[PDB]
Amino acid sequence: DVEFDALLGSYCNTLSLVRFLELGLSVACVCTKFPELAYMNEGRVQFEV
Amino acid sequence: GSPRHHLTRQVILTDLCQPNADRAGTLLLALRHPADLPHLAHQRAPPGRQTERLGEAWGQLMEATALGSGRAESGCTRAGLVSFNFLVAACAASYDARDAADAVRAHVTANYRGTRVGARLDRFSECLRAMVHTHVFPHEVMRFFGGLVSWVTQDELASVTAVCAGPQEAAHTGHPGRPRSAVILPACAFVDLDAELGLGGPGAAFLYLVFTYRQRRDQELCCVYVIKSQLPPRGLEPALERLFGRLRITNTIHGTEDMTPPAPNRNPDFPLAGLAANPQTPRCSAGQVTNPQFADRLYRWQPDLRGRPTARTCTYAAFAELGMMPEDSPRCLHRTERFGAVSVPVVILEGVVWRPGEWRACA
Amino acid sequence: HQPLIARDGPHPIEQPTHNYMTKIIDRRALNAAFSLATEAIALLTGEAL
Amino acid sequence: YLGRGAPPLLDNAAAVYLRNAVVAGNRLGPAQPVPVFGCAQVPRRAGMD
Amino acid sequence: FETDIAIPSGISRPDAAALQRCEGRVVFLPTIRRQLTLADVAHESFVSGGVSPDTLGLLLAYRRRFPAVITRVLPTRIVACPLDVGLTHAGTVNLRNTSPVDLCNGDPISLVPPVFEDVRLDSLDLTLRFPVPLPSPLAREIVARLVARGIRDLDLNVLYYNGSRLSLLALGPVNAELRSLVLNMVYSITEGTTIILTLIPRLFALSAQDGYVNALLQMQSVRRLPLYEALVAWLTHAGQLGDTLALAPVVRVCTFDGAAVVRSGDMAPVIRYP
């Protein structure tokens, strides 16, 4: 009596590297980065009319 | 080089505790789920008290915690964390330095986020006035939980991050502007035993939590003390006897009430020292005992223990280890910090290394 | 491989999960008939030549 | 009867009778009696449609 | 620091899956040692005597043995670390409940022998009894309940914890399994309260709320009856049980990056006192 078992192929994924600028939503932001934020308490932005 | 510590995280409602008003480095206290509280009070209480008082006092508290925003009283997630500055200001009408005690209550009823904050303190301290009467003691219910390092804020729930074991000055805060903390305690509780015994010698010292009770008929108090001492945990029971012995004098005579003693004195002297003298006294063997024709010739003896001031009703204190200060000389400061627009008598304990422990009654 | 999104708390932190699967091969077969008869043998053999 | 905080009537041969007439046979009313301190629960339905 | 408990040869196929199901469970061993045999680990390893030990003798061995929590289970050896020396270097070791009772954060955890209601390996002819890691404030309740049960034999089974209900009765063996505890708990008290009653023969005779308090307040200020030879028969006996019924907690749970309350069958991270 002769038998065998078999692994007939094994499959994986490709995780999609999503970037934020590639989206269409990237208009609704003003993205300028900090090298520090947690060194900062309440900051403010002024507006004149 | 960071020493080994152990952080905790628990999703905790901000009903009784606030990690926003109390800054980085106050004590905390875990609680049991309060569904256990008045069932034990129905069971463990001495004879002749109002067992439903705990279920009604704790009832009125939760029911006053919302009153509005349509919010259910039972919940899956439940606040079982009482902050330390909330607990001291609860029992703040039972200290000596009352002018500093209301200076703790001055930021408790103001700096907390909430509407009609002080309506809880007239109730939650009455809940502690029902813990003692319904006799489920809070050191059977309270439990240490670590000191704060950070908080993540949302409406009525927050992410409490504490240190359950290790040195306090080791865990990162979250803001790299001020990346550690210090143990911050109000001065209405921190009572030493160094100068108060005469121990002016330098050395390493232990920190303890100490509760006090006062068992009377609806005249019941509560205190919380964080005591620094150079004493062993085995050697605290004489030193707490020296301070709070007046409360022990009250509890042993006015704590036992509504029990009915047997009237008049019925139980005679115990004659076994005299019954063993005569060889002419009647006896019994191992098969003749538990027989009605033999036991009637023995000595009848009906002990009647009623109204005895038991050990469980003569408790005046209960302590637990909390941590040590391994320094050569323990370095304490005494400053006043600004919690918003309220300035507080503040004790700053520095260099605290955490070791929790079990409780121990001083009955 | 499942991906992640970062969430604000105080909901607890979710981590990368992963998935790993096998499948059993199911096995089927077929049939067809052919039949001949008595005279069909003897013409190919030689018993009726 | 799920709620709590209303003064019951005095002759307790009747306050027991009303609860055993409305909660008895109910789609919502509790099975275990209400805790004096917490909140009653809703009995579990077998199915949801 | 991880020891090795080697499995001897000849393991059947369900039994390699049976030991695959005790992943995070508390096990007692004699001495901390880098190599150890499974026959010194099992319930057979302390059936010494002629009767297999009941719940009393289980407690005595648990203070003479050094508790270890199993890490990964390789099919050749059981890798474990003990709770006394291996946990100063490695920080936190997972632990699985067998309790009917859930764990909260910050509880200290003692251990109880399986008094409530047990992997058997018939390729190796041994049983593996395991302790019940319940929280330590219940430990001075539950054992005090079950001792109080047998005293009725010569209402009680109500227990609440964490908004739940517990039923200890769930009758046959367990009352007979807990005979030796009941016959020492009674004896120590009846020896105590007759010697105390012999030294001061008036302790039952004074008026309780009137004259007995003066007898209490004075205590607080700073042939032949073989009585003074019988303190030692009491004090050593009572001084022995003060360790066994203490049920000292080795284990405190500090939850981090997880659920607040850990349920049955789940895992809870564990540290010792540092």
Q: Which two tokens stand for residue B64?
A: 């006053």
Q: Using CB atoms within 10 A of its CB, is residue B85 exposed (0-12), middle (13-18) or buried (19+)?
A: buried
Q: Which two tokens stand for residue E257?
A: 């990056």
Task: Tell me how crowded residue B103 is: count the other CB atoms within 10 A of its CB.
Answer: 22
**What method was applied to determine this entry?**
cryo-EM
Is B273 within 8 Å of E107 when comparing Cβ atoms? no
Q: Which residue of chain D is at minimal alpha-carbon distance from B35?
A: D38
Those residues with Cβ within 8 angstroms of residue E126's Cβ, 6 or more apart along the chain or in another chain: E38, E39, E42, E43, E44, E120
* Contacts C12 to B, Cβ<8 Å: 9, 11
Tell me how far apart the alpha carbons of residues E69 and E25 are, in angstroms, rounded to a whole number.
6
CB of B79 less than 8 A from some CB of C: no
Is B308 within 8 Å of E212 when comparing Cβ atoms? yes
Residue with tokens 């909260």, as numbered in its chain: E104
Q: What are phi and psi of E164, to 5 degrees?
A: -120, 180
Total residues belonging to chain B: 363
Tell me how far apart the alpha carbons of residues E256 and E30 are, in angstroms, rounded to a whole number.
32
Contact B246, B260 (CB under 8 A): no
Tell me how far apart the alpha carbons of residues B158 and B156 are, in angstroms, rounded to a whole number.
7
* Contacts A38 to B, Cβ<8 Å: 174-177
Residue with tokens 């009848």, as numbered in its chain: B300
Contact B59, B258 (CB under 8 A): no
* Contacts B159 to C, Cβ<8 Å: 9-10
For every residue of D1-49, DSSP letters joined together read -----SPPPS-HHHHHHHHHHHTSS-SSS-SSPPPSSS---PPPPS---
- Residue B220, CA distances (Å) to B46, B47, B128 in order: 16, 18, 9
Tell me how far apart the alpha carbons of residues E163 and E140 are, in angstroms, rounded to a whole number.
19
User: Exposure string (b/e) for B42-79, b if CB count within 10 Å is 16 or more?
Assistant: eeebbeeeebbbbbbbbbbbbeebeeeeeeeeeeeebb
Cis amide leading into B326 (omega within 30): no
Tell me how far apart the alpha carbons of residues B319 and B231 are, in angstroms, rounded to a whole number.
13
* Contacts B73 to D, Cβ<8 Å: 38-39
Contact B199, B193 (CB under 8 A): yes
Contact E135, E101 (CB under 8 A): yes
Max CA distance (Å), chain A:
92
Beta strand E3-6 with E36-37 is: parallel
Q: Which two tokens stand for residue C34?
A: 């052919």
SS3 content of chain A, % helix, strand, coil (to 5): 5, 0, 95
Minimal CA–CA distance to E130: which of E27, E61, E41? E27
CB of D5 less than 8 A from some CB of B: yes
Contact E155, E130 (CB under 8 A): no
Contact B331, B183 (CB under 8 A): no
* Contacts B32 to E, Cβ<8 Å: 162
CB of D43 less than 8 A from some CB of B: no
Q: At what angle do helices B118-133 and B52-65 cross, to 10 degrees?
A: 160
- 3-state SS class at B53: helix
Tell me how far apart the alpha carbons of residues B226 and B187 are, in angstroms, rounded to a whole number.
10
Is B157 within 8 Å of C8 when comparing Cβ atoms? no
Contact B184, B26 (CB under 8 A): yes
Contact B188, B92 (CB under 8 A): yes
CB of D36 less than 8 A from some CB of B: yes
Distance from chain centroid for Cα B158: 25
CA-based nearest distance B153→chain C, Å: 7
Total residues belonging to chain E: 274
Q: At what angle do helices E179-199 and E231-244 cross, to 10 degrees?
A: 140
Those residues with Cβ within 8 angstroms of residue A21's Cβ, 6 or more apart along the chain or in another chain: none
Report the amino acid identity of residue B208: Y
Distance from chain centroid for Cα E230: 29
CA-based nearest distance C20→chain B, Å: 31
Is E223 within 8 Å of B164 when comparing Cβ atoms? no
Contact E141, E148 (CB under 8 A): no
Query: Which of D33-36's residues contact partners 24+ apart within 8 Å by CB, and which partners?
Result: D34/D1, D34/D2, D34/D4, D35/B35, D35/B55, D36/B38, D36/B52, D36/B55, D36/B56, D36/B59
For every residue of B219-237, DSSP letters joined together read ---EEEEEEEES--GGG-H
Report the amino acid identity of residue E220: Q
Total residues belonging to chain A: 49
Total residues belonging to chain C: 49
Cis amide leading into B264 (omega within 30): yes
Is D37 within 8 Å of B73 when comparing Cβ atoms? no
Q: Which two tokens stand for residue E143?
A: 């054992």
For every residue of B241-292, DSSP letters joined together read HHHHHHHHHHHHHHS--S----SS------THHHHTT-TTS----TTTTT-H
Tell me how far apart the alpha carbons of residues B299 and B312 are, in angstroms, rounded to a whole number.
32
Q: Which two tokens stand for residue B335?
A: 């400053």
- 3-state SS class at B42: helix
* Contacts B23 to A, Cβ<8 Å: none
Contact B86, B108 (CB under 8 A): yes
Best D37, D39, D42 member to test B by mutation, with max B CBs in 10 Å, is: D37
Contact E28, E59 (CB under 8 A): no
Q: Which two tokens stand for residue E175?
A: 């009352």
* Contacts B24 to A, Cβ<8 Å: none
Is E213 within 8 Å of B253 when comparing Cβ atoms? yes
CA-based nearest distance E257→chain C, Å: 7
